[PDB]
Amino acid sequence: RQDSKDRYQYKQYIYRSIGGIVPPEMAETVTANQTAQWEAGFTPYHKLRLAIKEICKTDGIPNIKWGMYIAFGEKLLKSYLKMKAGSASSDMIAEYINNAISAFSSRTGISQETAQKIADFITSNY
Amino acid sequence: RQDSKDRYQYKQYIYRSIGGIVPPEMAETVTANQTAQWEAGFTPYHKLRLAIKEICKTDGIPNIKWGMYIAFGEKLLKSYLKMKAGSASSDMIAEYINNAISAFSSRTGISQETAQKIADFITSNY
Amino acid sequence: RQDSKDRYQYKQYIYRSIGGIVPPEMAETVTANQTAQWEAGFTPYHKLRLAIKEICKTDGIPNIKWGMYIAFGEKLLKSYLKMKAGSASSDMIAEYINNAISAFSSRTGISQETAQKIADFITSNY
Amino acid sequence: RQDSKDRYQYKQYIYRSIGGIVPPEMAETVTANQTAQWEAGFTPYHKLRLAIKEICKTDGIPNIKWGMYIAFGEKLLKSYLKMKAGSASSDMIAEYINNAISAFSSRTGISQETAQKIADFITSNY
Amino acid sequence: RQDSKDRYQYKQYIYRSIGGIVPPEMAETVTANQTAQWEAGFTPYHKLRLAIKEICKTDGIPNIKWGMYIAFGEKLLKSYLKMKAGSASSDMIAEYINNAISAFSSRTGISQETAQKIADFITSNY
Amino acid sequence: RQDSKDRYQYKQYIYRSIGGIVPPEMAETVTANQTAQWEAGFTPYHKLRLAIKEICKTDGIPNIKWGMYIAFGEKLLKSYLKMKAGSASSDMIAEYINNAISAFSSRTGISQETAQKIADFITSNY
Amino acid sequence: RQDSKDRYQYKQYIYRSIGGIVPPEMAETVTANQTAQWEAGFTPYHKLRLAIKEICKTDGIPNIKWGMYIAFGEKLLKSYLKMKAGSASSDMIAEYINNAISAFSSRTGISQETAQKIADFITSNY
Amino acid sequence: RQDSKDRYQYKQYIYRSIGGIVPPEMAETVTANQTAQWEAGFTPYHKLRLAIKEICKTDGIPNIKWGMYIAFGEKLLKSYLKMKAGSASSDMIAEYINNAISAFSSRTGISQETAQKIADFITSNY
Amino acid sequence: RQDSKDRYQYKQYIYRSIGGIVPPEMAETVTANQTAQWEAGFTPYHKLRLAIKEICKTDGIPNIKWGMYIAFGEKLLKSYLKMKAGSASSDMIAEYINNAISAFSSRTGISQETAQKIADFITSNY
Amino acid sequence: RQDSKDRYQYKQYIYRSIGGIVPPEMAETVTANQTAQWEAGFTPYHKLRLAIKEICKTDGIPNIKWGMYIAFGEKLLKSYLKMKAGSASSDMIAEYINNAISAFSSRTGISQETAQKIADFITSNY
Amino acid sequence: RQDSKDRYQYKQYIYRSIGGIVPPEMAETVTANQTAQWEAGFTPYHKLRLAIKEICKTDGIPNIKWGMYIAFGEKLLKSYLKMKAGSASSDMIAEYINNAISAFSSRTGISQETAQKIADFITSNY
Amino acid sequence: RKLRQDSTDRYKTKLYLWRNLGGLIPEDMAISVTESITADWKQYNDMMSKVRNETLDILKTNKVATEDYIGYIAFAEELAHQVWKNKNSSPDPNTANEASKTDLESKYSDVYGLDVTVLDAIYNAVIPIIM
Amino acid sequence: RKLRQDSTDRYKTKLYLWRNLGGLIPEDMAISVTESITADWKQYNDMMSKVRNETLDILKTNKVATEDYIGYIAFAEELAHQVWKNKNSSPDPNTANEASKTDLESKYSDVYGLDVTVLDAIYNAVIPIIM
Amino acid sequence: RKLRQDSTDRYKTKLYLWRNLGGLIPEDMAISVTESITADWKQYNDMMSKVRNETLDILKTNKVATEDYIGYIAFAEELAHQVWKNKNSSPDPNTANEASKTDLESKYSDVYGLDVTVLDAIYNAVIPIIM
DNA sequence: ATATATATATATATATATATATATATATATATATATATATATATATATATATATATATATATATATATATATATATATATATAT
DNA sequence: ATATATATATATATATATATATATATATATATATATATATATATATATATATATATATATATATATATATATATATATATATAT
């Protein structure tokens, strides 16, 4: 399903948002462009989520906790993207991890050991 | 009938759902894609149902009970697909079977012996 | 996103402003023209902002201060464009910098050293 | 902006003035014609204004005074167009300049030397 | 302006006079026809006026007096058109000129010499 | 003007007389038909009037008297049309002429010689 | 005029009689039908009247008497139509003629010889 | 006239009876339906009346007596329609004829021989 | 009748209650809403009544007693709805039944055996 | 019922209060606005009452006492809203509870243990 | 409530004051205008009152004293508006504060320290 | 309110548009949609809210983290549905048995624990589940 | 006023038009939009204003330049949301811990300093944050 | 009057039409426009008139030619805005400094002279500039 | 009657992404409208002074024509209503 | 099978009005266009120079909604397909 249905329908979504009042040379052309951005923008996080799934199976750890392994990973990737503006990533990374890990009950909910592993896997995504 | 009529009309269905307001470069292209997913997604369960039919004839057991041999099989396949996330399938399998079999009056309605045979046939589907 | 979404939607904006009462030979043709002006008009400042981002990373200085590095840079570019009317740019440049730098708390908020660097980078934009 | 936005929107203006009650074979056709006259009619004065801008930079004289260098130039061009009816332009020219220059505080506000230069540049426009 | 704006808008005028209650097969078709008559009917006098302008420049005589050179010329052309009914144009011409010239203060206001020249130029228009 | 403006506006007249309450399939269709009758019905008299104009120029006789040359001609044509019912046109013709000519002060007002010429020209119209 | 104006306006008449309260699917459709009946119903008498006109010219007899040649003819045609119910037309014909002719001062007013000719011409109309 | 005017106006009648307060989806739809019933209901008697007309011409008998040939025929047809409820038509027929004929002065007024012929012609209408 | 007439007219009722002074955006919108509540609110009891009808036929018991089988059932359903507030339904149920059954002459009037059956059928309605 | 009937009729109420003398652009617009405030203003207390209902069922305590569980809860919420002005909510809360609980016979009528639970549930509403 | 109910009803008030004798083109148009003035005129004081509420919470001071914090603030704002006529606001401000503070028992009733803070907050409102 | 109530109109929005784009009759659509939005909203929220509410309150009481509720809620409904299934199709002994055997089944997921066993007991005793 | 209040109508404008261009029913749209503009305006301004107002006043008190507020405001809300997250999902000790650990986290940005620590303490003690 | 007052209706005219051509609701538009024309007219004329009036009177007093006012007015507002900017964002010493440093900056234009320095001193002391 | 699957919408719990709108803080840009100060240009309307032209209406004098209504004299026809 | 009205059309034959068109000959208004020459407004565009709003896009940084897509996990409807 996620192999193709996304771009096909996502384009349909935008067409609807653009409205039937907008000539097709704009309606479709804008749609296609915005979709391409969705595909490119979405993928990086999608890759993380898929990787996380495999990590948990590898570790032999709970499926429910994916809600947080994912949240944790996704939050950090946003942070890693921001680091391309902040610079000094070494310090930014440590700081994001510091709370992402330490605030166990709200930022992890998952073993700090596995949370860090995710932090490391996410780091590798640049 | 089921040899071809499904993909032919299923595509027609989606076209209708998409709506006459959507340009054909989207209406048909989306339709065809979604249908392909139907074909691929559907088949695994279809194969089980067809296999089940033959098993009952082989065993020499009631046709009416197909409602449950099918329900039982289909439920388990969903479970087997989930096992690709859960891991430790050996234990998940046992647990699904434990209740699928034990709750005779609501999960089987069929001899536990034949229910297990189906559980085994379904297992082979990965 | 900013690689293409701007021209695509900006055109849509104008179409809306023009109104549904205006024939398409005017609605779209005007839209496309005005957009082209947006692209050309916008770019010069966009380039500065992007350059500024890199300068701060290079210097190893605060991200928050971009609000002013940008404001400072953008203000000066407007001034540099005006210099093409004023002439004697050598003096106009000095005067713009004089206050842009001196009024620290309201025109810079950033080290005068880095503010000047931006003034120099902006100058190179002609 | 002034390279194209004028004809594009000016046409839109007229369309609005013509009114939605007028059939498109008249609304657009009249619009396009009137616009063409705008372009041709406007240009001569536009050229003067652009030339004046360069003259002041060349001379190294005040930008504010463009309000008058322009007013002065534009007034004279109107006069030069009238000379194509009046004839004896040699005398008409002198007379227009006589007051245009002499009434310093209201017709020039600019050095008579530079005002005359503009009078000469405008003269060359026929 | 007078090169095209006349027929374009004049048509618009009539459309308005015809009224929004009249079907377009009549509104526009009548408009276009009446306009064509305007163009043809108008031109003969327009030609005179343009010719008169040049005559005064040629002679080196006052612009203000165009009010009368024009009035004089236009009146006579009306007379020349009437001569196509009256016949004996030689006598009608003389009579129109007799008063058109003699009543200096109200029919000419212009030198009789130049008034006659106009009478001659108008005569050539048949 | 009389070359086309008549049929164009005359149709407009009828449309108005028919009224805005009458559906266009009747309003315009009736209008067009009635107009065609106007054109055909009108022409015969129009031709006479135009011919009369030329006759007076040919003869070298007064323009004012056209009021009667026309009245005389038009009256007789009506009579000639009636002769297509009366028969014995030779006698009807003579009788119409007898008074049309004899009652000089009220039926002619024009030389009997020229009145007869018109009677002859009209006769040729059948 | 009578070549087309009748059906065009007669339809308009009925439309008015039907009333503005009646939907157009009835107003026009009824109108058109009733008109067609007018055309067909009217024609037979119209033909007689036209024929009568020619007969009088042929005979060389008075125009005024058309009031009666027509009345006589029209009355008889009504009678001939009635004969298609009465039968024995030979006798009905004679009887209608007997008084139509004999009551000279009120049924003819025209020579019995010409009245009979009309009776014969009308007879031929069946 | 009777070839079409009936259904056209009869519909108009009902529309009036229905009233202007009733929505057109009911006013016209009911009208059209009721009219169709008029056409079908009316025709059977219309056919008789037309047939009767021809019978009298065939027989060579009085037109005035149509008032009774018609009344007689129409009365009997009503009776024949009733026979489709009564059965034993052979006896009902005889009885209707018995008085329809015997009461000469009020049920016939026409020769019993011709009255019977009509009774026979009507019988054939079922 | 009860298949649709209820919602159709019930809406009409409310419209009347709302009053002709209330704008239609309120009159109809409120009406439709309140009706929907009628449909939903009514149905639960309607279902019971219909079920009761069938129970009596099944049992082979008196029709007249429906007045009480219905009253009994309806009363209990009200009680069952109240139990969703009271909790401890097991005890509330017993208590409602205790008197609903015991007070034979006023709460049942029907065999306690059949009254209990209804109590059981009603219980199943939650 | 309470799912929609409130806003529908409440609007009707206001319309009545506004009066039939007030133009609809005010009558309805004011009504709709005031209703929206009712919905928003009402809800907070409605939520408490619904929550209280569930608490009593959960606890297994008397329905009659809802009169006080509700009164108690509603009073406290009013107090909690006031605390947004008073500040130092910790102390205000304690004081409201002090009497709300202590004056058993008039402020609770319910076990202090359950009254406090309500005080705690209400507190969570901010 | 105060987010919208004010303008909605305030308009209603004026409508009532204007009277039912005044045509709606005046009644509503005047109402709407006067209301707009209410909104604009009211807001400045409303802002102060809201600010004061927050100041007292911030300071941790008595709610009852709002009667005076408000009175004090509102009085001063009136004074600040008057200063736009008086000029020399520095002195007017001091004088208003001098008594507004000094007459503790009647102009403040609140700590002079907090009264001054309000005087300062109000001052910032211009 | 809005997060459970407004769903009526949002669901309505599509159901109408789905049909509207088919060129169908405005009136028939409005009717079909009305019935659809009613069935959807009513059936969903009635069954779901009862389970979800009990589920949310119990899990919160038991110190369940917000990221944990999904497991217990996904089970809450699945289990609650099986409870109806049995109340409808099976003997009381099988309803009781199945409830216990399903709690065991749920062990396939890391989620399963005391929380589940508590929740199901509540559903069986308390909630008239739609299915 | 206008800069926080008029947003209701501007937001309304689009939400209606978005749907209007879909050929949807005027009434359903007006209803769906009404609910949307309410949820938007209400939820946004309530949560945002409380934080933004405290944030603006504190930062101004502490001599923060107008170009600096962005950092502290962007944090103000982010932090304020995390405060709710914890009040909702975590034990009180974790709410306190997270607040302090987040203040540390915020060091990733040049913005972080005393101003942040002051602001968060206020949010925790004062504002009923929506999330 | 007309040259400052009628702008309300002319601005209104477009703002309505801009939206009207989008197929938007007449009522919502009338409301959105009303707020727009108010904000426009009010904010513009209040700030602008105070500066422009003082600017016009001072420049006229100082024998400034009508063609000269543009420079001083364009500066008048620009400067007046910077005055607010500082009153809002900077320490009083910086407001004073900036005013003087800006007067210097203004030298980039041939316009700058005593007239400017006089005008800015007035704006700082007199006008509650909107920005 | 029970259970899948593909899509479409809404929910439950948390978190992304693409776009759409509004905000918070400051500053650009493209267009749209209004202003400030002076001056053009294209069109739209009105004026000032005189004179045309195209159409639209009315008149002065006489006479047609096409239609619309009424009359004068007799007689039809189509429909509409009432009578015998 | 025939008539009396009224409204429409027609025939023979003519007229009085009213509205439209035309001929000869001319004018008074009103609306449109033009010539010579200039201006006051209003709406559009532009030049020099700057700003207040509103709508769109963007930068830094973050959020609240709404609509779409996705991940983990499950469900209620509706529309399509499938198995018995």
Numbering used by the authors:
A (entry chain D), B (entry chain B), C (entry chain F), D (entry chain H), E (entry chain J), F (entry chain L), ...: 7 to 132
L (entry chain A), M (entry chain C), N (entry chain E): 6 to 136
Quote the study that presented this structure, word for word:
One example is provided by hyperthermophilic archaeal viruses of the order Ligamenvirales which contain non-enveloped, rigid rod-shaped viruses of the family Rudiviridae and enveloped, flexible filamentous viruses of the family Lipothrixviridae. Virions of lipothrixviruses are more complex and are built from two paralogous major capsid proteins (MCP1 and MCP2) which bind dsDNA to form the nucleocapsid. The nucleocapsid is enveloped by a lipid membrane and the termini of the virion are decorated with specialized structures involved in host recognition. Membranes of hyperthermophilic archaea often consist of unusual tetraether lipids, which form monolayers rather than bilayers typical of bacterial and eukaryotic membranes.
A three-dimensional reconstruction of AFV1 not only reveals the gross morphology but also has allowed us to build a full atomic model for both the two MCP subunits and the DNA. Surprisingly, we find that the two capsid proteins form a pseudo-symmetric heterodimer that resembles in many ways the symmetric homodimer found in SIRV2, and that both interact with the DNA in an equivalent manner. Interestingly, the helical pitch in both SIRV2 and AFV1 is ~42–43 Å, but in SIRV2 there are 14.7 homodimers per turn, while in AFV1 there are only 9.3 heterodimers. In SIRV2 there are tight contacts across the helical turns, while in AFV1 such contacts are absent, allowing the virions to bend, extend, and compress. At the same time, due to looser protein packing, the AFV1 genome is not completely covered by the protein, while it is in SIRV2. Consequently, the lipid envelope provides a necessary protection to the AFV1 genome in the highly acidic environment of the natural habitat, rationalizing the presence of the envelope in lipothrixviruses. The outer diameter of the virion is ~185 Å, while the diameter of the nucleoprotein core alone (excluding the membrane) is ~135 Å. Surprisingly, the membrane is only ~20–25 Å thick, compared to ~40 Å found for archaeal tetraether monolayer membranes and the 40–60 Å found for other cellular membranes and the viral envelopes derived from them, but a crude calculation done by integrating the cryo-EM density (which corresponds to the Coulombic potential but will be roughly proportional to mass) suggests that ~40% of the total mass of the virion is due to the membrane. Lipids were modeled with a single phosphoinositol headgroup, as this is the smallest headgroup commonly found on GDGT lipids in the A. hospitalis host (the others are dihexose and sulfonated trihexose headgroups). These lipids frequently adopted a U-shaped or horseshoe conformation, and these horseshoe-rich envelopes with a mix of ‘inward-facing’ and ‘outward-facing’ lipids were the only ones that stably maintained the curvature and thickness observed in the radial density profile from cryo-EM.
